[PDB]
Design a binder for this molecule. Structure first.
Ligand SMILES: *[C@@H]1O[C@H](CO)[C@@H](O)[C@H](O)[C@H]1NC(C)=O
Lengths: 49, 49
């Protein structure tokens, strides 16, 4: 590569990371959390504890 | 594909035969990793002295 300080767009170093999500027979294990709301009491509500 | 290990310790006084007592075993650890285990071994640390 020919990275130079005056090189414009197209010649400068580009950092690239590729994420591959495979779903094979093993149980899924990588993913984010779920938002937890504030808890209420003494009111007819519905919930997903 | 889950390896479950349940454990329980109990002080005893009798030498050889298993006691005529009763005690449940709590769920201790779960492992969400799938393997085809068929046979198992045991590990000792002999007094190399
Ligand atoms: C055990 O082997 C069978 C076929 O031999 C396979 O279908 C199964 O997924 C294997 N389980 C493992 C590797 O945990």
């Amino acid at each position: 590569y020919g990275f130079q300080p005056t090189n414009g767009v197209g010649y400068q170093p580009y950092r690239v990371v590729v994420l591959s999500f495979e779903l094979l027979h093993a149980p899924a294990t990588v993913c984010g959390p779920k938002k937890s709301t504030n808890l209420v009491k003494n009111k007819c509500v519905n919930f997903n504890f | 594909g889950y390896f479950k290990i349940y454990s329980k310790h109990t002080p005893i006084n009798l030498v050889r035969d298993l006691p005529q007592g009763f005690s449940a075993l709590e769920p201790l650890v779960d492992l969400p990793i799938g393997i085809n285990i068929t046979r198992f071994q045991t590990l000792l640390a002999l007094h190399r002295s």
